Homo-oligomer: A and B are copies of this chain.
Amino acid sequence: ATVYLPPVPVSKVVSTDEYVARTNIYYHAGTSRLLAVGHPYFPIKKPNNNKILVPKVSGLQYRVFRIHLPDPNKFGFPDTSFYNPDTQRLVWACVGVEVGRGQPLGVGISGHPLLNKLDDTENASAYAANAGVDNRECISMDYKQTQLCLIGCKPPIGEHWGKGSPCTQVAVQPGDCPPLELINTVIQDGDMVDTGFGAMDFTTLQANKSEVPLDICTSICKYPDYIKMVSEPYGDSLFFYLRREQMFVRHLFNRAGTVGENVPDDLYIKGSGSTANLASSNYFPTPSGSMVTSDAQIFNKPYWLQRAQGHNNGICWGNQLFVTVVDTTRSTNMSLCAAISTSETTYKNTNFKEYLRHGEEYDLQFIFQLCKITLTADVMTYIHSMNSTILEDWNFGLQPPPGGTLEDTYRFVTSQAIACQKHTPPAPKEDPLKKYTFWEVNLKEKFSADLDQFPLGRKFLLQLGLKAKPKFTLGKRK
């Protein structure tokens, strides 16, 4: 520049598929399986202390991993360089991923010993059974079936309705629901999916703090904010998503507690008896999970990334991948027991102490394409306007210093002081993370160049070149 920052773009934003050439050099990577054994309901901590002994792990929460990748320009190379390192720079493209489940078919489960529930109002049994002191019951559910996986390279955006706070312009008091304002935030590991009360916080909306389970009270519940993400052309925040979700209405119920609502008292006619009074108009549909089937598994089959939502196809502008997984369908909870004493020789429920765990597996197989971004002066100006940090990291002119001189604290040694001594010694240092809240997967040298002996690999050779297998695949008929 000038002209001008550039032009044009904006408008029309140049794709990274017009000057970023693919190469036929392939490396292969994968993980060694991942296993995390939690307690979905709550983490089990030592209550004499504050540290976890069993974490919280669940498929009914987002499992969001921050994958850090090498860069090809760190290599000594096996000789993948035939040109000057300043006419081009190298970046990865990920062209296939399979995300495996090692968990059997069967659901996980959540619940609450005191879920806020009055009476049954699907078909009556009461108007109220209580409006004084207590009325909550032992009730469990498995939250709705959600399967989705989505892949990006910058952090995903979630939406949820946060607490818009009661206003005093229009009459809303405590004991009236607030106006609700949508407060959107990044999807991060440990966070709960939508429950079908809407996707909202429950940490400060809830004030009994015991309407719902131990798990969702203490999370933010979120719905994916597809909408802002698919409107970024580049799609660096995601360049792949899919979903399958469903839920059915188990039974209508009424919440524990009295109306806070204002009912116009002129939309009915008064009765006599039971029909004189009103129940609480705080009806809620009770939701419940769906039937699990092996034809609903979007997993253990490969998601290609040869093409992507974004201009991005896994192109490294940080050398990171974000992979978010939800699987509620193999999120088996396995039940077990240990006997408290062998002093009790009869069957007692004060003898054999039931315990639940959830075991969580994930494996990710990857095929990596080596790609290049060819740099001319004009290209370099576009990137500079785009994100300057990329140029510096690559290393590219024009840098000051010099620099110099003197220094201080001279001779001796100490020696007393003299001399100097100021002293004064440097670097706190401080501070931004940039962690933020993710299950760290380091890949740096799991990279390969054979892909005939990885299962994903074999299928990728089949798809790409129509060879090699190596001998044969399938049937026939069968």
Contact = CB atoms under 8 A, between A and B. Distances in A.
Interface in A69-88: 70, 74-78, 80
Which 3 A/B pairs are nearest by Cβ-Cβ distance? A5-B76, A9-B449, A6-B78
Nearest to A20: B471
Interface stretch (A11-19, A96-104, A329-337, A423-431): A11-19
Interface in A112-156: none
A470 B15 contact: yes
Contact of A12 (B7, B74, B446, B450): B450
Contacts of A7: 78
B76 A6 contact: yes
Contacts of A20: 471
Given A2-B74, A75-B2, A76-B2, A8 B470 contact: no
Interface string A424-452: 00000000000000000000111111101
A304 interface: no
Contacts of A74: 2, 4
Interface in A1-41: 2-13, 15-18, 20, 27-28
A453 interface: yes
Contact of A4 (B16, B17, B75): B75
B8 A452 contact: no
Contact of A8 (B12, B17, B27, B453): B27
Given A6-B78, A10-B28, A18-B470, 4 more contacts: A3-B445, A4-B75, A9-B27, A11-B450
Contacts of A447: 4, 6, 8
A445 to B, nearest CB: 5
How extensive is the interface on chain A, given as a class? 35 or more
Given A15-B470, A18-B470, A448-B11, A4 B453 contact: no
Contacts of A13: 453
A17 to B, nearest CB: 5
Most chain B C-beta atoms within 10 Å of own C-beta, residue among A10, A70, A75, A78:
A10
Contacts of A28: 10
A11 to B, nearest CB: 6
Interface in A203-238: none
Nearest to A80: B6
Interface string A225-257: 000000000000000000000000000000000
Interface string A151-167: 00000000000000000
A462 to B, nearest CB: 15
Question: Taking each of A3, A77, A448, which has the highest tally of chain B beta carbons within 10 Å of its own beta carbon?
Answer: A448
7 contacts: A3-B76, A5-B77, A6-B447, A8-B448, A10-B450, A11-B450, A16-B471
Contacts of A471: 15-18, 20
A5 B13 CA distance: 36
B27 A448 contact: no
A43 B18 CA distance: 53
Given A11-B448, A11-B453, A452-B12, A6 B75 contact: yes
A3 to B, nearest CB: 8
Interface in A456-478: 470-471
Contacts of A6: 75-78, 80, 447, 449
A15 to B, nearest CB: 5
Contacts of A17: 471
Contacts of A449: 6, 8-9
Contacts of A452: 12
Nearest to A469: B15
Q: Which of A13, A70, A453 has the most CB of B within 10 A?
A: A453
